[PDB]
Design a protein around this ligand. Structure first.
Ligand SMILES: Cc1ccccc1CSc1nncn1N
Length: 187
Protein backbone atom coordinates (compact mmCIF):
# COMPACT_ATOMS: atom_id res chain seq x y z
CA UNK A 1 0.00 0.00 0.00
CA UNK A 2 3.14 2.18 0.02
CA UNK A 3 3.78 4.68 -2.74
CA UNK A 4 7.10 4.98 -4.51
CA UNK A 5 8.15 8.59 -4.10
CA UNK A 6 6.34 9.00 -0.80
CA UNK A 7 7.41 6.60 1.94
CA UNK A 8 10.47 5.44 -0.03
CA UNK A 9 12.31 6.23 -3.25
CA UNK A 10 13.94 3.92 -5.74
CA UNK A 11 17.51 4.82 -6.67
CA UNK A 12 17.74 5.23 -10.44
CA UNK A 13 21.27 3.77 -10.23
CA UNK A 14 21.13 0.83 -7.82
CA UNK A 15 24.20 0.29 -5.68
CA UNK A 16 26.06 -3.03 -5.31
CA UNK A 17 25.45 -4.90 -2.05
CA UNK A 18 28.04 -6.09 0.48
CA UNK A 19 26.92 -9.75 0.40
CA UNK A 20 25.70 -10.77 -3.03
CA UNK A 21 22.97 -13.38 -2.83
CA UNK A 22 21.33 -11.90 0.24
CA UNK A 23 18.83 -9.06 0.40
CA UNK A 24 20.78 -6.23 1.99
CA UNK A 25 19.37 -3.89 4.64
CA UNK A 26 21.61 -0.94 5.50
CA UNK A 27 21.08 1.45 8.39
CA UNK A 28 23.14 4.58 7.97
CA UNK A 29 23.76 6.09 11.38
CA UNK A 30 26.02 8.16 13.58
CA UNK A 31 26.69 7.19 17.21
CA UNK A 32 26.19 10.81 18.27
CA UNK A 33 22.82 11.23 16.55
CA UNK A 34 19.98 11.49 19.09
CA UNK A 35 17.37 10.07 16.69
CA UNK A 36 19.70 7.14 15.93
CA UNK A 37 20.01 6.46 19.64
CA UNK A 38 16.21 6.66 20.07
CA UNK A 39 15.67 4.26 17.12
CA UNK A 40 17.88 1.55 18.62
CA UNK A 41 15.22 -0.11 20.82
CA UNK A 42 13.10 -0.57 17.70
CA UNK A 43 15.62 -1.60 15.05
CA UNK A 44 17.83 -3.80 17.23
CA UNK A 45 15.27 -6.53 18.07
CA UNK A 46 13.91 -6.43 14.52
CA UNK A 47 17.41 -6.91 13.09
CA UNK A 48 17.97 -9.99 15.24
CA UNK A 49 14.82 -11.66 13.88
CA UNK A 50 15.72 -11.37 10.18
CA UNK A 51 15.64 -14.51 8.01
CA UNK A 52 18.64 -16.25 6.54
CA UNK A 53 18.45 -14.61 3.12
CA UNK A 54 18.73 -11.09 4.54
CA UNK A 55 21.96 -9.32 5.50
CA UNK A 56 21.67 -6.38 7.90
CA UNK A 57 24.54 -3.89 7.83
CA UNK A 58 25.15 -0.74 9.83
CA UNK A 59 27.11 1.86 7.89
CA UNK A 60 28.44 4.96 9.58
CA UNK A 61 27.55 8.24 7.85
CA UNK A 62 30.90 9.95 7.32
CA UNK A 63 29.66 13.48 6.91
CA UNK A 64 32.73 15.16 8.38
CA UNK A 65 34.27 16.17 11.67
CA UNK A 66 33.15 14.13 14.66
CA UNK A 67 30.91 11.97 12.42
CA UNK A 68 34.09 10.70 10.74
CA UNK A 69 35.89 10.10 14.05
CA UNK A 70 32.96 8.13 15.49
CA UNK A 71 32.54 6.34 12.17
CA UNK A 72 36.19 5.33 12.18
CA UNK A 73 35.69 3.97 15.72
CA UNK A 74 32.70 1.96 14.44
CA UNK A 75 34.65 0.46 11.54
CA UNK A 76 37.57 -0.36 13.83
CA UNK A 77 35.25 -2.21 16.23
CA UNK A 78 33.64 -4.11 13.33
CA UNK A 79 37.09 -5.11 12.06
CA UNK A 80 38.04 -6.35 15.51
CA UNK A 81 34.82 -8.38 15.69
CA UNK A 82 33.67 -6.61 18.83
CA UNK A 83 31.18 -3.95 17.67
CA UNK A 84 28.07 -6.01 18.43
CA UNK A 85 29.12 -6.51 22.04
CA UNK A 86 29.96 -2.83 22.80
CA UNK A 87 27.39 -1.18 20.48
CA UNK A 88 24.94 -0.29 23.24
CA UNK A 89 27.77 0.83 25.56
CA UNK A 90 29.08 3.32 23.01
CA UNK A 91 25.62 4.82 22.53
CA UNK A 92 25.15 5.00 26.31
CA UNK A 93 28.56 6.55 26.88
CA UNK A 94 27.85 9.31 24.39
CA UNK A 95 24.19 10.04 25.21
CA UNK A 96 23.86 9.23 28.93
CA UNK A 97 27.39 9.63 30.26
CA UNK A 98 28.24 12.69 28.12
CA UNK A 99 31.52 11.13 26.96
CA UNK A 100 32.84 12.69 23.78
CA UNK A 101 34.89 9.72 22.50
CA UNK A 102 36.55 12.26 20.21
CA UNK A 103 40.15 11.02 19.96
CA UNK A 104 41.50 7.50 19.51
CA UNK A 105 43.20 7.75 22.90
CA UNK A 106 39.91 8.58 24.60
CA UNK A 107 38.17 5.81 22.67
CA UNK A 108 40.80 3.24 23.62
CA UNK A 109 40.62 4.15 27.29
CA UNK A 110 36.82 3.85 27.30
CA UNK A 111 36.73 0.67 25.25
CA UNK A 112 39.33 -1.02 27.46
CA UNK A 113 36.72 -0.70 30.20
CA UNK A 114 34.53 -2.87 27.98
CA UNK A 115 37.28 -5.46 27.40
CA UNK A 116 38.57 -4.18 24.04
CA UNK A 117 42.31 -4.68 23.47
CA UNK A 118 43.73 -1.12 23.53
CA UNK A 119 46.84 -1.74 21.47
CA UNK A 120 44.90 -3.65 18.84
CA UNK A 121 42.21 -0.96 18.76
CA UNK A 122 44.75 1.80 18.19
CA UNK A 123 46.70 -0.20 15.58
CA UNK A 124 43.53 -1.05 13.71
CA UNK A 125 42.12 2.48 13.95
CA UNK A 126 45.19 3.86 12.18
CA UNK A 127 45.50 1.00 9.67
CA UNK A 128 45.42 1.31 5.89
CA UNK A 129 42.54 -1.17 5.76
CA UNK A 130 40.39 1.13 7.87
CA UNK A 131 41.32 4.06 5.59
CA UNK A 132 40.02 2.04 2.67
CA UNK A 133 36.82 1.18 4.49
CA UNK A 134 36.27 4.84 5.36
CA UNK A 135 36.55 5.78 1.68
CA UNK A 136 34.20 2.97 0.66
CA UNK A 137 31.64 4.08 3.27
CA UNK A 138 31.86 7.67 2.00
CA UNK A 139 31.34 6.56 -1.59
CA UNK A 140 28.40 4.38 -0.60
CA UNK A 141 26.64 7.23 1.21
CA UNK A 142 27.16 9.40 -1.85
CA UNK A 143 25.69 6.69 -4.06
CA UNK A 144 22.67 6.37 -1.76
CA UNK A 145 22.40 10.19 -1.87
CA UNK A 146 21.86 10.21 1.87
CA UNK A 147 21.80 13.58 3.62
CA UNK A 148 20.83 12.62 7.16
CA UNK A 149 20.41 9.75 9.62
CA UNK A 150 19.03 7.38 10.46
CA UNK A 151 18.38 6.34 6.86
CA UNK A 152 17.61 2.86 5.55
CA UNK A 153 18.53 1.38 2.20
CA UNK A 154 17.14 -1.97 1.04
CA UNK A 155 19.11 -4.01 -1.49
CA UNK A 156 21.05 -0.99 -2.76
CA UNK A 157 17.80 0.11 -4.38
CA UNK A 158 15.26 1.69 -2.00
CA UNK A 159 15.93 4.58 0.35
CA UNK A 160 13.68 5.67 3.21
CA UNK A 161 13.85 7.17 6.69
CA UNK A 162 11.77 7.51 9.85
CA UNK A 163 10.10 10.71 8.67
CA UNK A 164 9.18 9.30 5.28
CA UNK A 165 7.84 6.02 6.65
CA UNK A 166 5.90 7.76 9.43
CA UNK A 167 7.58 6.51 12.60
CA UNK A 168 10.05 3.92 13.88
CA UNK A 169 7.76 0.84 13.74
CA UNK A 170 6.50 2.02 10.34
CA UNK A 171 10.07 2.20 9.04
CA UNK A 172 10.64 -1.47 9.78
CA UNK A 173 7.25 -2.53 8.36
CA UNK A 174 8.30 -0.69 5.20
CA UNK A 175 11.67 -2.47 5.26
CA UNK A 176 9.84 -5.81 5.51
CA UNK A 177 7.66 -4.91 2.53
CA UNK A 178 10.68 -3.97 0.39
CA UNK A 179 12.56 -7.12 1.42
CA UNK A 180 9.54 -9.14 0.22
CA UNK A 181 9.53 -7.15 -3.03
CA UNK A 182 13.14 -8.15 -3.61
CA UNK A 183 12.65 -11.77 -2.59
CA UNK A 184 9.89 -12.09 -5.20
CA UNK A 185 12.03 -10.66 -7.99
CA UNK A 186 13.45 -12.88 -10.71
CA UNK A 187 17.22 -13.38 -10.84
C1 LIG B 1 31.92 -1.34 2.02
C2 LIG B 1 32.02 -0.98 3.46
C3 LIG B 1 32.85 0.04 3.87
C4 LIG B 1 32.93 0.36 5.22
C5 LIG B 1 32.18 -0.34 6.15
C6 LIG B 1 31.34 -1.37 5.74
C7 LIG B 1 31.28 -1.69 4.39
C8 LIG B 1 30.38 -2.78 3.93
S1 LIG B 1 28.81 -2.20 3.38
C9 LIG B 1 28.65 -2.32 1.64
N1 LIG B 1 29.52 -2.74 0.72
N2 LIG B 1 28.94 -2.66 -0.48
C10 LIG B 1 27.69 -2.19 -0.35
N3 LIG B 1 27.49 -1.99 1.00
N4 LIG B 1 26.39 -1.52 1.63
Amino acid sequence: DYTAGKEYVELSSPVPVSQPGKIEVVELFWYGCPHCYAFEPTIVPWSEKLPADVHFVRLPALFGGIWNVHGQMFLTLISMGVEHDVHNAVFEAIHKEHKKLATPEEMADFLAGKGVDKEKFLSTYNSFAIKGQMEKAKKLAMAYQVTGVPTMVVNGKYRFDIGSAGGPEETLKLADYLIEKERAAAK
